[PDB]
Amino acid sequence: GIEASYKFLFKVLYNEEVEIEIESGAGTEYDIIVQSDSLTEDLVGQTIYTATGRCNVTYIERSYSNGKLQWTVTIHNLLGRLIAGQEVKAERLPSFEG
Amino acid sequence: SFAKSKMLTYVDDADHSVIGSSATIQMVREVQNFYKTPEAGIKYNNQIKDR
Amino acid sequence: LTSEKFEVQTIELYSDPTDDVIFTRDGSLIVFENDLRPQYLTIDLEPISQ
């Protein structure tokens, strides 16, 4: 059931061939800092999307700078290249505008 | 669970004579990201008094 | 009101329970450990004699 077991499976039985699979899974993490109100936690686990890109949220830790409110969100499994100035609305609890 | 009387037996056992003690407890949950709250939450059980 | 108009280090939200047993459920803890937060004791001595 763990990743890299597939890679062991397809070697042994189905063909000899290699495998690669991606869900919203484990993977490398990136650092992104976002400013909004309404960012109250439990967004971790949701799917953030911007106009350009889509992604998920591992860790919500807050950053410190004067003005607004700025959190540094730990993001993984990113695809679609989110860029500065985007409006970054979450899929659910919609209420996220940032 | 944290019992007021179960801690007061250890604070009573500090030194030979403390001749007992009393306390009043304030329940406090610090929550990062004020201004919003997580749409449901800051739930601390054991219903608190009025105001 | 937009943010950045406040300062607000973090927050506390003190409260006074009706019961003194004060259970915990779901995800939670108690975590006294005064060394990082010595704003809670304020334990006070009341000297007497006889």
From Swiss-Prot, chain A:
Top-level taxon: Viruses
Subcellular location: Virion
Role summary: Intermediate/inner baseplate protein. The gp25-(gp6)2-gp7 module is involved in sheath contraction. Involved in the tail assembly.
Assigned protein family: Belongs to the T4likevirus baseplate wedge protein gp7 family.
Subunit structure: Heterotrimer with gp6; assembles as a (gp6)2-gp7 heterotrimeric molecule. The (gp6)2-gp7 heterotrimeric molecule further interacts with gp25 and gp53. The gp25-(gp6)2-gp7 module is involved in sheath contraction. Interacts with gp8. Binds to gp10 homotrimer; disulfide-linked. Heteromultimer with gp10; a gp10 molecule is disulfide-linked to gp7 and the other two remaining gp10 molecules form a disulfide bond.
Record protein name field: Baseplate wedge protein gp7
Species per Swiss-Prot/TrEMBL record: Enterobacteria phage T4
Biological classification of the source: Viruses, Duplodnaviria, Heunggongvirae, Uroviricota, Caudoviricetes
Full-length numbering of the shown residues: 739 to 836 of 1032
Swiss-Prot record, chain C:
Localization, UniProt: Virion
Induction: Expressed in the late phase of the viral replicative cycle.
Function text: Baseplate protein that is located next to the tail tube (inner baseplate). Involved in the tail assembly. The gp25-(gp6)2-gp7 module is involved in sheath contraction.
Family membership: Belongs to the T4likevirus baseplate wedge protein gp6 family.
Subunit structure as annotated in this protein's UniProt entry: Homodimer; each gp6 molecule in the ring interacts with its two neighbors, forming an N-terminal dimer with one and a C-terminal dimer with the other. Heterotrimer with gp7; gp6 is part of a (gp6)2-gp7 heterotrimeric molecule. The (gp6)2-gp7 heterotrimeric molecule further interacts with gp25 and gp53; the gp25-(gp6)2-gp7 module is involved in sheath contraction.
Name of the molecule in the record: Baseplate wedge protein gp6
Gene: 6
